[PDB]
Design a protein around this ligand. Structure first.
Ligand code: 1C1
Ligand code: NAG
Ligand code: NAG
Ligand code: NAG
Ligand code: NAG
Ligand code: NAG
Ligand code: NAG
Ligand code: NAG
Length: 336
């Protein structure tokens, strides 16, 4: 183990909260980072048991703690209140670096699925730039798989283990609350989504011999996980995906059965004030949404799934440590 530090291009003149936090909590990234390629070496990685994930998790928690102040914060029977000003919120890439005396192993096997042996290895001082994007169901503004779609699980046969799909082509998603002040919506091109679930259906079909692979909405639970929740400019969006995860893959073909219109799937969204915290068990209450057009144009770079004659997969999430995993799976902290 170690104590990693972070590096970023945070502007000290920037009011945006990620910048304000990184400037005081992080170090300036290196303008030209080099890696140290290695042959005749193979190392084992376990994305599911990586301490780097917990360290980033802890930073993002303190980053949010300092950045997003909820009016009220309830933990059972006790409540804390404070000023909760609206802020400039837009994630920036964070780099994680090993201190003097340690390094960071980097798997270069472009098909490596997070766990097991990795032949093509390398050594770096810092990870690549990772946007600490908090969301469920859909992974946003992340990196793409270089060659084909990659299915990641701590155990695939264990239907309780979250599955991380690493897309090799991003699907664009635009969410907007137009200038009901809490009513918003997202647009997704159905063509891109059809192709996405077609491929994803194939990669899954593999792993699961010959079964009718269905995609359905989250069976139930808190809104944070039964919908695609995320933060857009500080506002907490909860977007319905019952028309997104709605289809079936059989006989090597995908059929989207979710509603769509002129080739665009739209998610009905709801900007909420009361939010079940991901940082800890509790509820945070924020002020009503700011005025004007609130829009976030993002890229879907991965999916979070949970499997139930037909296998059924549903959108998952909730443990933000999986969001960090989807980018940190390549890395491993090692000693010198
Ligand atoms: N209920 C809570 N108190 N905390 C528990 C977390 C941890 C966990 C693990 C699995 C499934 C769900 C959860 C709980 N997660 C959240 O409530 C959650 O993820 N909330 C959240 C909150 C805001 C945004 Cl933008 C978002 F994407 C998510
Ligand atoms: C990923 O690859 C490893 C070998 O490195 C294998 O043991 C494991 O079953 C694979 N995981 C999945 C879910 O396909
Ligand atoms: C993306 O990955 C999927 C994996 O199933 C593959 O089918 C598709 O051809 C890939 N696209 C590329 C490599 O351009
Ligand atoms: C994964 O889960 C299945 C079913 O729960 C179990 O039989 C299997 O032992 C698990 N695999 C590992 C390597 O733990
Ligand atoms: C999503 O929208 C559908 C269609 O109205 C609805 O049936 C379902 O209850 C919604 N899901 C959630 C989590 O509210
Ligand atoms: C698929 O979408 C349709 C149209 O919105 C909806 O009526 C149906 O309930 C969905 N199927 C599910 C939720 O599995
Ligand atoms: C995918 O969606 C597009 C856009 O509406 C549509 O033209 C096409 O028929 C769909 N194909 C599949 C496989 O669902
Ligand atoms: C994703 O990145 C884009 C480009 O910077 C940004 O406009 C968008 O708001 C981001 N989405 C989220 C959810 O942070």
């Amino acid at each position: 183990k170690t104590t990693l530090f972070c590096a970023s291009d945070a502007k000290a003149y920037e009011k945006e909260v990620h910048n304000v936090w990184a400037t005081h909590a992080c170090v300036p990234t290196d303008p030209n980072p080099q890696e140290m390629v290695l042959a005749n070496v193979t190392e084992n990685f376990n994305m599911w048991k990586n301490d780097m994930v917990e360290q980033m998790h802890e930073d993002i928690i303190s980053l949010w703690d300092e950045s997003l102040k909820p009016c009220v914060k309830l933990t059972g029977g006790s409540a804390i209140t404070q000023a909760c000003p609206k802020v400039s919120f837009d994630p920036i890439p964070l780099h994680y670096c090993a201190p003097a005396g340690f390094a960071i192993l980097k798997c270069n096997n472009k098909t490596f699925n997070g766990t097991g042996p990795c032949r093509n290895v390398s050594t770096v001082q810092c990870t690549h730039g990772i946007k600490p994007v908090v969301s469920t169901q859909l992974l946003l503004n992340g990196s793409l798989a270089e060659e084909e779609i990659i299915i990641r699980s701590e155990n695939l046969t264990n239907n309780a283990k979250t599955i991380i799909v690493h897309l090799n082509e991003s699907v664009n998603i635009v969410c907007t609350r137009p200038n009901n002040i809490r009513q918003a919506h997202c647009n997704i091109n159905e063509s891109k989504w059809n192709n996405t679930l077609q491929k994803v259906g194939e990669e899954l079909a593999k792993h699961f011999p010959s079964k009718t692979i269905k995609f359905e909405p989250s069976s139930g639970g808190d809104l944070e996980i039964t919908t695609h929740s995320f933060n857009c400019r500080g506002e907490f969006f909860y977007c319905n995906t019952s028309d997104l995860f709605n289809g079936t893959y059989r006989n090597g073909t995908y059929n989207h059965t979710g509603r769509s219109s002129n080739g665009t799937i739209t998610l009905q969204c709801k900007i909420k004030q009361i939010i079940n915290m991901w940082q800890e068990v509790g509820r945070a209450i924020y002020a009503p949404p700011i005025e004007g057009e609130i829009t976030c144009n993002s890229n879907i770079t991965g999916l979070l799934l949970l499997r139930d004659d037909t296998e059924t997969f549903r959108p998952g999430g909730g443990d933000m440590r999986d969001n960090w995993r989807s980018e940190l799976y390549k890395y491993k902290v090692v000693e010198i």
